[PDB]
């Protein structure tokens, strides 16, 4: 799935002819040095997602973080508070 | 659900008597200044999760990040690459 530094338009060309939603490639972005981009076919067009990096060197596309404790709590009523177990928050009685 | 700076043991005391898995409170940690802890009843005991913060001031409990592009790609075969749409990666044919 890794296509090196192929032009963005060529990635769109290849993916547009793909039959299945989700057909994808990783390419090296012509924008900023050292960047990676994920191009994916979805429906009638091709979408591009920047591969992000953090200070530790890790990769990610998107992460969920919260502007308030209240939003963290409400989010974890339906997503587990633990990576290793399914634990969902319920109000104290 | 916010109980201020109540002792950890008192949080365990209250939550242990709760009937439902997921009963919870947020308290201010007696460990490091300005810290928050989430205490949750689950099964026979009470688990404690540090509320983490990032440089932007946001809160989170856990985030998913990757040590390699290969792990990012494989993870997003089953979790959407987009926060706003359900897009899952499929190999090119």
Resolution in angstroms comes to 2.0
Task: Render A30-61 in DSSP notation, one character per residue.
Answer: SSSTT-EEEEEEETTEEEEEEEEE-TTS-EES
Contacts of A53 (CB under 8 A, 6+ apart): A59, A60
Q: How far apart are CA A54 and CA B6, in angstroms?
A: 35
Residue of A nearest to B92 (CA): A23
Task: For the beta carbon of residue A59, count every other beta carbon within 10 angstroms.
Answer: 19
Domain-wise residue ranges, chain A: 1-93
Put residue B43 in one of left, alpha, beta given phi > 0 → left and psi -120 to 50 → alpha: left
Cross-chain Cβ contact A72/B87 below 8 Å = no
Domain topology for B1-93: SHC Adaptor Protein (3.30.505)
Q: List the single best residue of A15, A38, A59 to mutate versus B (max B Cβ within 10 A).
A: A59
How many angstroms separate the CA of residue A9 from the nearest CA in chain B?
17
Chain A residues whose beta carbon lies within 8 Å of the beta carbon of residue B14:
92
Residues of chain B neighbouring A56 (CB-CB closer than 8 A):
65
Residue A69 DSSP one-character state: H
Elucidation technique? X-ray
**Pairs from B30-39 (Cβ < 8 Å, separation ≥ 24):** B30/B5, B36/A69, B37/B8, B38/A81, B39/B8, B39/B11, B39/B12, B39/B15
CA A21 vs. chain centroid, Å, equals 16
Q: DSSP readout, chain B?
A: -B--S--HHHHHHHHHT-SSTTBEEEEE-SSSTT-EEEEEEETTEEEEEEEEE-TTS-EES----BSSHHHHHHHTTTS-S-SSS----B---
């Amino acid at each position: 799935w890794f296509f090196g530094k192929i032009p963005r338009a060529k990635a769109e060309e290849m993916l547009s002819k793909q039959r299945h939603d989700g057909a994808f490639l990783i390419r090296e972005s012509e924008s900023a040095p050292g960047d990676f981009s994920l191009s994916v076919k979805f429906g009638n067009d091709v979408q591009h997602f920047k591969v992000l990096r953090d200070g530790a060197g890790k990769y990610f596309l998107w992460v969920v973080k919260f502007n308030s404790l209240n939003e963290l709590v409400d989010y974890h009523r339906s997503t587990s508070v633990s990576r290793n177990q399914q634990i969902f928050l319920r109000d104290i009685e």
